Structure formats: structure tokens, C-alpha cells
């Protein structure tokens, strides 16, 4: 639904084959807290807690 | 049970729940509810239910022992609709597919046995059991493999256990015997003066014929609880 | 295109102030914008409306000038 | 108010199908296919996801507060895998809130089985 | 040459062996030449076995494992990886890679 | 301090709590020229003043290459034009046109074999500031181009149409549009 704000707990690193995309573990900020893997894209540390609108489509881990 | 209330979906918009209960010797004899339509020209809603069959768990039939026989299934087939109630008789059981995987093992023997056997009552069933061997305590060997005469003896054993043991009981004491697991067990005792075995279990029982109207059958199955014995 | 460069206003001089009064803040391309009048034509106009103590110069650039009312309430 | 959940999970398609403990009577019915246009999408969990949430509300609408789950590939001479949108299916019935009974597998596995298309050489693709 | 002593196949004391299927190609393959590996994982996916296990009303329902065994043929493998082209030497070792899962 | 010392610096604040971090205005000092070596190390970038990034852009398509005081001085009468319709500080519009013109969503290939579908993915805080910031400045130069509107009209106006959320402003549409494609291929 209305997107959720989630933080980053760890950088799971680049994928993609060009490294655009780097894997990150999100938490959601209102109550709830899920530890799931979700691919972000751009130059991304530890603790941007980032927003996602998509909420419940978790991606793989890179193999 | 939602639409005899109030209002669900255009086909559920005329539709009933029915309350479904299994035989004395379960725990927890209801089993859940069943959709069915209302009744028409020649659909009568009683008569549509008369023959469903359910697939009930043994951890749900008899809940409180789920860690034993949690694999162990049976299927049950109403036969009478009184007092808006489903009243089931046994027509199946077979052990859960996850635990059928895991009896097989590479270095082991199966022996799988089926035996049709004539009840003391009308029904006629086939016994489905398998076996496995296993390693003796000191093995030198990897492999759990026995020759051919304790191959023949065993399985001329399973036969016998079932022999003396489900071949001459009437529905009612099967379902009790196959329950609480004893003819299972008893299968194990006799295999265990033969070989080293494990996994001795009747996997499944198919009801091969029903004697017509086992209405008769379904007071015993279902109301002699206190006719327990 | 907003074609008329001399002074154009004749009877509209009135009509050409109530739309540059009407708007609280104005730029010489925005009053050629919003009515059909040439950009050098409004810096010769805005200069009646400065002086007159119409509009005052919030900021100032040979390049872009920023003109706002005084009052006009 | 249990009832029983079969999920086809296979390839091509999924399907998502709430009944009765019978199986007689279907209580409601998705499919994966439905919901995405193209048809390489089908099989996806993400196609998977959206259709499972669209069949919640049909069937807590008609009861079903709990379900117990059978999930099944394609089974027969084929994959025995369960194959893209089966995990998703019971993780989009759990962000619904319909309560888990007891986990299956439904493969249609076929003893001694018939011949399966392809040929000796294979699919030489 | 002979490539593997072997002959690819663990056939011994045989002349003919059963025949089997490439999952995925479903060609035709000797039952000695296939790859064979057994296979037991979780019916559900392993990141999601724990919520679904709380949302289990049963008491102590161990979650299910599919227990299954997967047959590939030699070119098969070879594209999915299943075993890996190796060097002359490293092919007369017969124990599996980082020591059935 | 205040930004340009003419427009008051204030506490000016983020809505978002994404681009609280990767948006600063604490360093914000008058005249956005400041030298200092923002393109350094991987998020150095991060710390840079809000106006400055945006001053930095003006000067595109190879026609204004180099040209800061050009371009300070038309963010300096874009801030007043913004400032003279909203009757607020710029540096508070700046903020929220930023924020809302950003794309949240974006979409890449996962490089899947041979398949280049373009599957959906989650966007960097600071790649969002960027891409606002970015489309803020290439929409306020569509505008312009041969049109009577000078840039600093059309700058002013892009800010202040992306701050609200209207469609209008390209910003906010680059934002709805690179969206819906996300969700299309998500």
C-alpha cells in the first residue's frame, strides 16, 4: 500500500552485471521491523534509511 | 459458515454450511463445515452431501499427541446427513507424502507388502505396510542388506503379523487398532526377532468394497461411544 | 507574436495598468507575455509605473528586472 | 473456519484455489495469469503476489478464516519441482492474515511412469 | 584415448542398465552415465519457514521437507553446473566438493 | 547568515526523512560559490549545500560550460521571483521541490542472461536528490530555449510548480513517469 520508510542494517553488495544495483536490508520504521533484502539502485552507505513503494516484493540474494 | 448468515459472492449468495462430525473413537470429532448449495428441483442440498469425502489428519482427528503419527492421515466419507449433520465413516488412511520421502534411504532394503483382508463386518480393505533394514550395532559394512532368506521370512512374517492380527476384526476395532498404531507395532515385535528393521508401518488402508447402507455401522462407528471396549 | 513596439497602448494605456496592477509582481517579458506588447516596449512603460511610485525595483540587472506593487489593496 | 488451499505452482501459470475440506465445492479461485499481460510473467512470484491478495478478499468476505495448504508442480512426467510462484503463495496468504493449518505436497507423482515428450536426443535446444 | 577408466559409466558386471531422464532435456541417458542427486529441502521457502511456522495453529508442526531425488544427463549438468569440467589430475578424485544436503 | 544575505536563512527543515541526511542546508553560507572538493571520495557529495548543487547544474549543454557567476546570479533572481509570489523563504520552497521532483521508484536490467527486462528497484536518497535536482534544472531549461520567458522567469516558476506536486512542472512528471514505468515492470 502507501510506501513505508525501512533502514538499512547492512550493504549485501553490487549486482546486475554492471554493479548498478546494490543489495540492501531493510527494516520498516512504523512498528512492524522485517529483515528483508531489497535491491536498491545509486550510491547508498549504512543507515540511509531508505522508502520503498513496493513494500512486500523482496528480491533474491545475489548469487 | 457465512452465507446462510448474510451476504458472499452470486453463487454463494443462495448457499449453505453444514456441520461435520467423525467417529467416536477421535478426540475432536468435528472435522469443519461444508459449502453447499440450496435446495433444488432435484438438488436437495442433504442428498448433494450424502457421499463427500473428507482428509482429516490424525493430529487433528485426535489433537493433544500431534508429535506422534503427525504424518498419519485418514479419509472419511459422510453416509448419513442427520440432524444437519455430516456423520462420517472410515474409507481411507495413507501416512503423509514428506514422511513416505524420508522412510526410503540409500543402503536399506524395502519390503512393501499389500494384503486385501475380508472384515468381520462387510467391508473388504487392502493393507498397504512397508519395511526397511537397518544397520546392526557393529556393521563393518555401510550397507543395511540382508539375504534372501531373511528377505522371505520377513515379508512370510509380515503377512502372519496382519494374519492374526487384522485379518479377522470388524471395521470399529480396525479403526481403534489402526490409531492408537498397534497392529503397526505389532508388525515390529515379530520383525524385530527376525532382523534389525526399521520403519514398520502400515503406510496405507483402501477401502476396496462397502457393504450397501452401512447405516448400521455408522451408530457403532459414530454414537457406541459407550461402547468403547 | 506580441508585435506592437512603440508605446502601442492608445485607449488600452488604462487597460495595459489595471492587468499590470492586477498583478502583484511583474517582469518586463511577463507583461509581454501576458498581453500582446513587445518586452522593449514594457521597459519604457514600467518606467511610468516606477516613477509614478506604482511599482518598486526588487532587483535590478541589465538582464532580468524584478518589479513589484507598492500596495494595490 | 477451516478449509483447504490447493496452490498449482508448476511452471506457465499459477493457480491459487481456496475449497472445502471436500474439495467438492470451490469456496474461491486466482490465477497468476490474470493478473500480468505478458505471458513469460505468469509463472512470477510477483504475478503470484498480486493474485493472492486478490483472492483474500473474496474468501475471508465468504469465512475461511483459516486454510490448510496443499501446493503441488506439475508433477507427472514433469519438473517435480514447485517452480517460481509457490514460496510466494503462502507468504502473500500470510501478509493477508489467513491462518496456516498443515503444509503438503500434492505432486501428482506417478509410480512405474508413461513416456514423457522430448525423444531420446532430448529438447536440442 | 581412454578419457576416464571408467568409461563415464559405473557400469560393472552389467552389459545393459535401465534408462533414465534428463530433467530439464529430458534425453534418453544410461542410469549408470546419470548424475544423481538427492535432493531434501523445505516445502516452503526457507526464508519464510519461521512466520510461517508461528502463523501454524498446529502445536509442534515440524514444517514438511520435500524429499526428492534429481537426475541430469551429462551435457545437461554441464550447463547447469551441476558438476564442473575438471583438470586432468583433479578427475581421479571421486569425493564430493566441500564435502547429501 | 543568510542565504545570498538577502533571502533570511532560517531554520529551514526536510519533510522527507530519506533526504533529511543526503539534503543539507546547515552548511548553506551566502554566495553559493564556495570552492571545495564535493566531487571527492564516493559521498563527500552528500554534504553539499542544497543551492549549490542546483547552481551547479545551470550551467549546461555546453553553452553556459564553466559559467557559476551566471549561474548564481539567475538562481539569485529565480530566488526572488520565487520569493516575491510565495512570499516565503526559497531556501524552504528549494527544499520541498527537491523532495517531491525526486523519483522514488526506478527500474534496471539485473543483467538476467540474455534478458533485458527492465525489473524495478529501490532508489539511493542521495540518487533521488540528484535526479530532482537534475530534472529541476533541464525542465527550467526546456522552458526557456527560443521561448520570450528568460531562465530566470522559468527557473523560479519550476521550482515553485514542483513544490506543490503539480503534473505541469517536468520534475514532478519525470517523477510520475519513471514510476509508472517501474510499476509496469516491476
Given at each position: 500500500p502507501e510506501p513505508i520508510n525501512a533502514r538499512v542494517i547492512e550493504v549485501l553488495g553490487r549486482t546486475s552485471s554492471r554493479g548498478g544495483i546494490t543489495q540492501v536490508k531493510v527494516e520498516f520504521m512504523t512498528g512492524e521491523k522485517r529483515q528483508i533484502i531489497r535491491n536498491v539502485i545509486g550510491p547508498v552507505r549504512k543507515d540511509d534509511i531508505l522508502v520503498l513503494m513496493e513494500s512486500e516484493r523482496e528480491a533474491r540474494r545475489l548469487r | 459458515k457465512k452465507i446462510t448468515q448474510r451476504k458472499n459472492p452470486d453463487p454463494y449468495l443462495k448457499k449453505e454450511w453444514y456441520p461435520v462430525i467423525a467417529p467416536a473413537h477421535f478426540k475432536s470429532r468435528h472435522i469443519g463445515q461444508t459449502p453447499v448449495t440450496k435446495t433444488a428441483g432435484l438438488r436437495v442440498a442433504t442428498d448433494v452431501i450424502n457421499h463427500r469425502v473428507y482428509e482429516v489428519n490424525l493430529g487433528d482427528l485426535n489433537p493433544g499427541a500431534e508429535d506422534l503419527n503427525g504424518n498419519t492421515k485418514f479419509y472419511l466419507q459422510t453416509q448419513l446427513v442427520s440432524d444437519g449433520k455430516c456423520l462420517t465413516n472410515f474409507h481411507g488412511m495413507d501416512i503423509t507424502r514428506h514422511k513416505y520421502?524420508?522412510?526410503?534411504?540409500?543402503?536399506?532394503?524395502?519390503?512393501?507388502?499389500?494384503?486385501?483382508?475380508?472384515?468381520?463386518?462387510?467391508?473388504?480393505?487392502?493393507?498397504?505396510?512397508?519395511?526397511?533394514?537397518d544397520?546392526?550395532?557393529?556393521?563393518?559394512?555401510?550397507?543395511?542388506?540382508?539375504?534372501?532368506?531373511?528377505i522371505r521370512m520377513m515379508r512370510a512374517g509380515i503377512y502372519e503379523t496382519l494374519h492374526n492380527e487384522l485379518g479377522k476384526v470388524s471395521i470399529p476395532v480396525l479403526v481403534t487398532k489402526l490409531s492408537n498404531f498397534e497392529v503397526n507395532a505389532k508388525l515390529t515385535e515379530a520383525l524385530q526377532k527376525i532382523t534389525m528393521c526399521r520403519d514398520v508401518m502400515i503406510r496405507r488402508?483402501?477401502?476396496?468394497?462397502?457393504?450397501?447402507?452401512?447405516?448400521?455401522?455408522?451408530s457403532t462407528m459414530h454414537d457406541s461411544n459407550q461402547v468403547r471396549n | 507574436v506580441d508585435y506592437p513596439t512603440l508605446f502601442a497602448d492608445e485607449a488600452a494605456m488604462?487597460?495595459?495598468?489595471?492587468?499590470?496592477?492586477?498583478?502583484?509582481?511583474?517582469?518586463?517579458?511577463?507583461?509581454?507575455?501576458?498581453?500582446?506588447?513587445?518586452?522593449?516596449?514594457?521597459?519604457?512603460?514600467?518606467?511610468?509605473?516606477?516613477?509614478?511610485?506604482?511599482?518598486?525595483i526588487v532587483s535590478k540587472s541589465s538582464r532580468m528586472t524584478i518589479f513589484k506593487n507598492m500596495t494595490k489593496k | 473456519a477451516?478449509?483447504?488451499?490447493?496452490?498449482?505452482?508448476?511452471?506457465?501459470?499459477?493457480?491459487?484455489?481456496?475449497?472445502?475440506?471436500?474439495?467438492?465445492?470451490?469456496?474461491?479461485?486466482?490465477?497468476?495469469?490474470?493478473?500480468?499481460?505478458?505471458?513469460?510473467?505468469?509463472?512470477?512470484?510477483?504475478?503470484?503476489?498480486?493474485?493472492?491478495?486478490?483472492?483474500?478478499?473474496?474468501?475471508?468476505?465468504?469465512?475461511?478464516?483459516?486454510?490448510?495448504?496443499?501446493?503441488?508442480?506439475?508433477?507427472?512426467?514433469?519438473?517435480?519441482?514447485?517452480?517460481?510462484?509457490?514460496?510466494?503463495?503462502?507468504?502473500?496468504?500470510?501478509?493477508?492474515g489467513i491462518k496456516i493449518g498443515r503444509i503438503e505436497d500434492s505432486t501428482p507423482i506417478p509410480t512405474d511412469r508413461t513416456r514423457h515428450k522430448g525423444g531420446r536426443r532430448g529438447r536440442r535446444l | 584415448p581412454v578419457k576416464r577408466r571408467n568409461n563415464g559409466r559405473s557400469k560393472y558386471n552389467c552389459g545393459h542398465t535401465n534408462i533414465v531422464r534428463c530433467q530439464n532435456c529430458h534425453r534418453c541417458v544410461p542410469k549408470?552415465?546419470?548424475?544423481?542427486?538427492?535432493?531434501?529441502?523445505?516445502?516452503?521457502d526457507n526464508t519464510i519457514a519461521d512466520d510461517v511456522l508461528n502463523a501454524c495453529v498446529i502445536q509442534g508442526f515440524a514444517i514438511p521437507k520435500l524429499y526428492n531425488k534429481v537426475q541430469y544427463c551429462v551435457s545437461c549438468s554441464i550447463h547447469n553446473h551441476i558438476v564442473r569440467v575438471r583438470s586432468r589430475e583433479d578427475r581421479k578424485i571421486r569425493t564430493p566438493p566441500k564435502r547429501n544436503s | 547568515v543568510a542565504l545570498f544575505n538577502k533571502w533570511p536563512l532560517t531554520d529551514v527543515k526536510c519533510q522527507d526523512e530519506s533526504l533529511e541526511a543526503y539534503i543539507s542546508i546547515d552548511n548553506h553560507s551566502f554566495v553559493p560559490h564556495?570552492?571545495?572538493?564535493?566531487?571527492?571520495?564516493?559521498?563527500?557529495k552528500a554534504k553539499c549545500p542544497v543551492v549549490e548543487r542546483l547552481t551547479n547544474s545551470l550551467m549546461m549543454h555546453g553553452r553556459n560550460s564553466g559559467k557559476k557567476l551566471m549561474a548564481m546570479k539567475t538562481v539569485g533572481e529565480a530566488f526572488e521571483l520565487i520569493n516575491l509570489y510565495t512570499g516565503k523563504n526559497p531556501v524552504q520552497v528549494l527544499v520541498d521541490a527537491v523532495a517531491n521532483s525526486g523519483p522514488r521508484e526506478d527500474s534496471c536490467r539485473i543483467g538476467k542472461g540474455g534478458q533485458v527486462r527492465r525489473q524495478s528497484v529501490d532508489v539511493s536518497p542521495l540518487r533521488r536528490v540528484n535526479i530532482g535536482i537534475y530534472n529541476i534544472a533541464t525542465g527550467a531549461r526546456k522552458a526557456a530555449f527560443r521561448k520570450v520567458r528568460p531562465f530566470a522567469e522559468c527557473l523560479a516558476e519550476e521550482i515553485m510548480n514542483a513544490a506543490a506536486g503539480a503534473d505541469k512542472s517536468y520534475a514532478i512528471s519525470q517523477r510520475n513517469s519513471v514510476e509508472r514505468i517501474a510499476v509496469s515492470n516491476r
Amino acid at each position: 500500500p502507501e510506501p513505508i520508510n525501512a533502514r538499512v542494517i547492512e550493504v549485501l553488495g553490487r549486482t546486475s552485471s554492471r554493479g548498478g544495483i546494490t543489495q540492501v536490508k531493510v527494516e520498516f520504521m512504523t512498528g512492524e521491523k522485517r529483515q528483508i533484502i531489497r535491491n536498491v539502485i545509486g550510491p547508498v552507505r549504512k543507515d540511509d534509511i531508505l522508502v520503498l513503494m513496493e513494500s512486500e516484493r523482496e528480491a533474491r540474494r545475489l548469487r | 459458515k457465512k452465507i446462510t448468515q448474510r451476504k458472499n459472492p452470486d453463487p454463494y449468495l443462495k448457499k449453505e454450511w453444514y456441520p461435520v462430525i467423525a467417529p467416536a473413537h477421535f478426540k475432536s470429532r468435528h472435522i469443519g463445515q461444508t459449502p453447499v448449495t440450496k435446495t433444488a428441483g432435484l438438488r436437495v442440498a442433504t442428498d448433494v452431501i450424502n457421499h463427500r469425502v473428507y482428509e482429516v489428519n490424525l493430529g487433528d482427528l485426535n489433537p493433544g499427541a500431534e508429535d506422534l503419527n503427525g504424518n498419519t492421515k485418514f479419509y472419511l466419507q459422510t453416509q448419513l446427513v442427520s440432524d444437519g449433520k455430516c456423520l462420517t465413516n472410515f474409507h481411507g488412511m495413507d501416512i503423509t507424502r514428506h514422511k513416505y520421502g524420508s522412510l526410503f534411504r540409500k543402503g536399506c532394503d524395502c519390503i512393501d507388502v499389500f494384503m486385501d483382508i475380508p472384515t468381520t463386518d462387510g467391508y473388504l480393505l487392502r493393507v498397504f505396510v512397508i519395511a526397511f533394514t537397518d544397520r546392526f550395532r557393529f556393521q563393518r559394512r555401510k550397507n543395511c542388506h540382508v539375504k534372501g532368506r531373511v528377505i522371505r521370512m520377513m515379508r512370510a512374517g509380515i503377512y502372519e503379523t496382519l494374519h492374526n492380527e487384522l485379518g479377522k476384526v470388524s471395521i470399529p476395532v480396525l479403526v481403534t487398532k489402526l490409531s492408537n498404531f498397534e497392529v503397526n507395532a505389532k508388525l515390529t515385535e515379530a520383525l524385530q526377532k527376525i532382523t534389525m528393521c526399521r520403519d514398520v508401518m502400515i503406510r496405507r488402508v483402501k477401502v476396496v468394497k462397502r457393504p450397501r447402507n452401512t447405516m448400521e455401522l455408522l451408530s457403532t462407528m459414530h454414537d457406541s461411544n459407550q461402547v468403547r471396549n | 507574436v506580441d508585435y506592437p513596439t512603440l508605446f502601442a497602448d492608445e485607449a488600452a494605456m488604462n487597460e495595459a495598468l489595471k492587468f499590470i496592477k492586477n498583478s502583484k509582481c511583474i517582469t518586463h517579458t511577463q507583461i509581454c507575455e501576458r498581453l500582446r506588447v513587445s518586452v522593449a516596449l514594457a521597459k519604457r512603460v514600467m518606467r511610468q509605473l516606477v516613477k509614478s511610485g506604482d511599482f518598486a525595483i526588487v532587483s535590478k540587472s541589465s538582464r532580468m528586472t524584478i518589479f513589484k506593487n507598492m500596495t494595490k489593496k | 473456519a477451516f478449509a483447504v488451499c490447493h496452490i498449482y505452482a508448476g511452471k506457465n501459470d499459477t493457480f491459487i484455489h481456496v475449497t472445502d475440506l471436500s474439495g467438492r465445492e470451490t469456496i474461491g479461485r486466482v490465477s497468476g495469469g490474470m493478473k500480468v499481460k505478458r505471458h513469460c510473467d505468469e509463472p512470477s512470484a510477483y504475478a503470484a503476489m498480486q493474485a493472492t491478495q486478490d483472492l483474500i478478499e473474496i474468501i475471508t468476505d465468504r469465512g475461511i478464516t483459516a486454510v490448510h495448504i496443499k501446493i503441488r508442480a506439475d508433477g507427472g512426467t514433469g519438473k517435480r519441482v514447485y517452480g517460481q510462484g509457490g514460496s510466494a503463495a503462502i507468504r502473500a496468504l500470510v501478509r493477508g492474515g489467513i491462518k496456516i493449518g498443515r503444509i503438503e505436497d500434492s505432486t501428482p507423482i506417478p509410480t512405474d511412469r508413461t513416456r514423457h515428450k522430448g525423444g531420446r536426443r532430448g529438447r536440442r535446444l | 584415448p581412454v578419457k576416464r577408466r571408467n568409461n563415464g559409466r559405473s557400469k560393472y558386471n552389467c552389459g545393459h542398465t535401465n534408462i533414465v531422464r534428463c530433467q530439464n532435456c529430458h534425453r534418453c541417458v544410461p542410469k549408470d552415465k546419470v548424475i544423481k542427486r538427492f535432493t531434501i529441502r523445505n516445502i516452503v521457502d526457507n526464508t519464510i519457514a519461521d512466520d510461517v511456522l508461528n502463523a501454524c495453529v498446529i502445536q509442534g508442526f515440524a514444517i514438511p521437507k520435500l524429499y526428492n531425488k534429481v537426475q541430469y544427463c551429462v551435457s545437461c549438468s554441464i550447463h547447469n553446473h551441476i558438476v564442473r569440467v575438471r583438470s586432468r589430475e583433479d578427475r581421479k578424485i571421486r569425493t564430493p566438493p566441500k564435502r547429501n544436503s | 547568515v543568510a542565504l545570498f544575505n538577502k533571502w533570511p536563512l532560517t531554520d529551514v527543515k526536510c519533510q522527507d526523512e530519506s533526504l533529511e541526511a543526503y539534503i543539507s542546508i546547515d552548511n548553506h553560507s551566502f554566495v553559493p560559490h564556495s570552492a571545495g572538493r564535493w566531487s571527492a571520495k564516493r559521498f563527500r557529495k552528500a554534504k553539499c549545500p542544497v543551492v549549490e548543487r542546483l547552481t551547479n547544474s545551470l550551467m549546461m549543454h555546453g553553452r553556459n560550460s564553466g559559467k557559476k557567476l551566471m549561474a548564481m546570479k539567475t538562481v539569485g533572481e529565480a530566488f526572488e521571483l520565487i520569493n516575491l509570489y510565495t512570499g516565503k523563504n526559497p531556501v524552504q520552497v528549494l527544499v520541498d521541490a527537491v523532495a517531491n521532483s525526486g523519483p522514488r521508484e526506478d527500474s534496471c536490467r539485473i543483467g538476467k542472461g540474455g534478458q533485458v527486462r527492465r525489473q524495478s528497484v529501490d532508489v539511493s536518497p542521495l540518487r533521488r536528490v540528484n535526479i530532482g535536482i537534475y530534472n529541476i534544472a533541464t525542465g527550467a531549461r526546456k522552458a526557456a530555449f527560443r521561448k520570450v520567458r528568460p531562465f530566470a522567469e522559468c527557473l523560479a516558476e519550476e521550482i515553485m510548480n514542483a513544490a506543490a506536486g503539480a503534473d505541469k512542472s517536468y520534475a514532478i512528471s519525470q517523477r510520475n513517469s519513471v514510476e509508472r514505468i517501474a510499476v509496469s515492470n516491476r
